[PDB]
């Protein structure tokens, strides 16, 4: 008795046909990176983040601030490039 995946399966994207023409990470480290990025996305299956308390998860922040200082993007950029 099969069920139907809800949303995307993780590796369903890449082509199994013609594996030799696919680029691999021969680095352990590249893999580690890609994996840690994958572990930060909001998946549809029971996950560690879910049970172990991301602490309210998504939260819309009521902000009582002082307004952020207004500074010119392009000017600053130019000056820094120069420096």
């Amino acid at each position: 008795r099969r069920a139907a995946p809800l949303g995307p399966m993780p590796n369903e994207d890449i082509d199994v046909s013609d594996l030799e023409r696919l680029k691999k990470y021969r680095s352990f480290d590249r893999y580690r990176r890609r994996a840690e990025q994958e572990a930060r996305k909001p998946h549809w299956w029971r996950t560690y983040r879910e049970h172990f308390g991301e602490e309210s998860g998504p939260k819309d922040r009521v902000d009582i601030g002082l307004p952020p200082p207004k500074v010119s993007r392009t000017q600053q950029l130019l000056e820094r490039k120069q420096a």
Binding site: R2, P10, L19, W45
Partner: peptide, 19 residues
């Protein structure tokens, strides 16, 4: 688990051919 939607999530061997 076969009954579940998440079945075969850990399936890899089709990605690497070593035979």
């Amino acid at each position: 688990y076969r009954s579940k939607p998440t079945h075969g999530i850990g399936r890899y061997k089709h990605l690497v051919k070593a035979q």
